[PDB]
Design a protein around this ligand. Structure first.
Ligand SMILES: Cc1ncc(COP(=O)(O)O)c(C[NH2+]CCCC[C@H](N)C(=O)O)c1O
Ligand SMILES: Cc1ncc(COP(=O)(O)O)c(C[NH2+]CCCC[C@H](N)C(=O)O)c1O
Lengths: 422, 411
């Protein structure tokens, strides 16, 4: 289905009509993240078409991917920005995002970062009692009123939605609906510092069934009804992020952005609410491969290993979450290459350094290209310099099949800078 | 026990006689890694005394912690260096390590990195067939013969990506015989795992490694080194557990090594650097989710991923005496990062801290800073150490937002 990375019957992987092998030969022989700029455009356009007729902000979650060129591109197409730190807000402003389409969320927002948010006029979510006290303090410091959204855990039916219900009892995020009156009384006490403009929920990540959005929005509209009846002017419902994509490339049918917005469309329109959505994964994940070269193939007797140049330093998701990302070769394998089971592992000093397990692949020769698919979200953004494996360069392919560098490779000199003069 | 971070009866945390609260007030209000320079010295001295009477190399595993000042200090006390990448080799040479006491290990060493290793004349392990073919090629490119150790898995191993197949031993020997100009086989290498709490396994491994070395010598190879790897564990729970000492570890192999006139290489990381360090934090706030309590700190999985990645316990306590009548209750200690995996510890019995109070994560010297990311653009922390005289020196600059922006200059 319609993936921007396609294996044609010639046995070559393509991005936007360009062979990945040709792209690999044109850049340095080290691991790198490869994006389709058009697939970024297609992902954004699917949300824009889904929200047509609804007053809305598409809040791209920068925590997914903080490439400045990708952010400037999304901004150029009418995107807002969702931030979880002051530095993310500085990068959004540098990328040219409108502060009236920026939302600063978080369970531990620093007073420093809240002063920046108040100064720049962005939307700020309220996560806790200490959080609201810091936002009032940031208002007093900046001398600006802050536009706030209360982050509420919707009391979803635990027999229908056990994982979300339990998540609300165990998680560090959000306000229990039982404490709502405390927050409203506090807002009413600080009219100069606080303007309550809406309510916020965020329901999880990799959501593959949209019934949770339907059921949560019904509960969020009843909270907004109650808030409006107490005389607060509420104009936004932020339903958060979390729409999933297909990681398995096995034909699974996932809900679209249209399906997601169709669950809240009529209630939002009936209440004259602006809808904020906060997608990260569903905007950037499926636009990107982590591109590798095969170091070599080995066996310990039971398991076979394809050893690559890339590692848990660049891409930790499989190790950290036991997550599946799809793996395939870039080029036709030798005639006579045996298809069998491989763990795909990096050169890093521990057994947690794997990119995938139990994958049926043609035995690749040394130097063959290999990709980890759907590597656009929470991959580069979570990269380390473990084993002094310096962070990779990034490229993208444009509509004409031309290749542009969108991030410099990190160098060893960038490690040494930290000790300069010490 | 004998820990460099001590909680006085007065309710203050101390490092080498200096109050941690005093150190926090003297640096920027952001998370930082704080080390006892003296404790680094003690950890090394314990290995140095355990190895007296044995020809040996203490190969500090740089993957544990790559602070350049910590590397220089270990080098100044006679340490060797264990490396898993060319960049680690570059950093070790910059730290002034003797290439004769450097060991380059790995299951995916790059031809590039093997060329540098051959040029600099460091020991290089042999992990697989493809690896041996790469060392041979690196020898031809550099025109230097390579001193090699075969990495054996002495009988999490039917699953390991590391080491040769024991049953293919003869294949490796025949290949070394067949490349005299390129290869000199100098020894054998095993690494048994990490957080090892029972030195029995070292004893059993050494006996099997010595059978191998005897066979390799009988076939005419001049082998001088047994590299028994690292993996000695430390106490993370701080509740009186008694772990094998380095003296205990060397005592199980000492007579065997002497009887064969072998040079012993050990490759400690965790047991040189872990217990010297606290990850030092400020409390942003305390929140409740009904009966469930959270201490929210400025630190996170961006700086310290081990609890989340390995479900590892690291001890947590407050820096300063709490207010009288502060409820002692159960807390998760969590950062500001936008996901559930961002915790430093779960279900910890602590006095309710006020906003801005200091909180430490213990035994954070190993696989903590070295695995740090810029997730959520939480830029990496500065590092400080305490001297013998109780003064504080910066040993690493804090990363800045400019350090992100530099990746896009001219693009
Ligand atoms: C409050 C809030 N809003 C939006 C998002 C974006 O979610 P998504 O990218 O659309 O799913 C989030 C994100 N929450 C945590 C996501 C962690 C993902 C994890 N690193 C991974 O799977 O790699 C949010 O908190
Ligand atoms: C070949 C080899 N030699 C030495 C070591 C050092 O081990 P230790 O630090 O003495 O236990 C290793 C280490 N290997 C993997 C360590 C992973 C630890 C993990 N990141 C963690 O616990 O945080 C080695 O491979």
């Amino acid at each position: 289905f319609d993936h921007c990375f396609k294996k044609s019957s010639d046995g070559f992987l393509y991005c936007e009509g360009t062979k990945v092998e040709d792209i690999m030969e044109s850049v340095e022989r080290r691991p790198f993240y490869l994006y389709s700029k058009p697939q970024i455009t297609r992902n954004l356009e699917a949300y824009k078409e889904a929200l047509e007729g609804v007053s809305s902000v598409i809040g791209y979650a920068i925590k997914a991917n903080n490439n400045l060129k990708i952010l400037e591109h999304l901004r150029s197409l009418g995107c807002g920005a969702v931030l979880v730190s002051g530095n993310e807000l500085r990068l959004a402003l540098r990328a040219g995002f409108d502060p009236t389409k920026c939302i600063f969320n978080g369970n531990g927002k620093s007073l420093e970062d809240l002063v920046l948010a108040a100064q720049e006029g962005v939307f700020v979510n309220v996560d806790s009692e200490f959080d609201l006290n810091n936002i009032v303090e940031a208002s007093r410091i900046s001398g600006k009123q802050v536009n706030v959204l209360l982050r509420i855990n919707p009391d979803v039916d635990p027999q229908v939605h056990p994982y979300v219900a339990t998540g609300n009892k165990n998680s560090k995020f959000g306000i229990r609906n039982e404490k709502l009156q405390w927050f409203l009384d506090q807002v009413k006490a600080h009219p100069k510092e606080l303007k309550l403009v809406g309510a916020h929920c965020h329901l999880g990540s990799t959501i593959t069934k949209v019934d949770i959005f339907r059921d949560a929005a019904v509960l969020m509209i009843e909270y907004i009804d109650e808030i409006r009846r107490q005389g607060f002017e509420v104009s936004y419902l932020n339903i958060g992020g979390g729409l999933g994509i297909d990681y398995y490339h096995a034909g699974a049918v996932l809900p679209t952005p249209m399906d997601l917005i169709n669950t809240v469309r009529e209630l939002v329109l009936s209440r004259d609410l602006n809808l904020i959505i906060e997608p990260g994964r569903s905007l950037i994940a499926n636009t990107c491969c982590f591109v590798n070269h095969v170091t070599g193939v080995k066996t310990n007797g039971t398991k076979n290993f394809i050893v690559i140049d890339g590692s848990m330093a660049e891409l930790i998701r499989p190790s950290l979450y036991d997550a599946y990302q799809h793996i395939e070769l870039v080029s036709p394998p030798p005639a006579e290459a045996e298809v069998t089971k491989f763990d795909v592992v990096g050169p890093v000093c521990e057994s947690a350094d794997f990119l995938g397990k139990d994958r049926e692949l043609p035995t690749p020769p040394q130097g063959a290209g290999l990709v980890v698919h759907d590597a656009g979200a929470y991959c580069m953004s979570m990269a380390s310099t473990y084993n002094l494996k310096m962070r990779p360069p990034e490229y993208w392919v444009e509509e004409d099949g031309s290749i542009t560098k969108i991030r410099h490779a990190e160098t060893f000199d960038d490690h040494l800078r930290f000790f300069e003069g010490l």
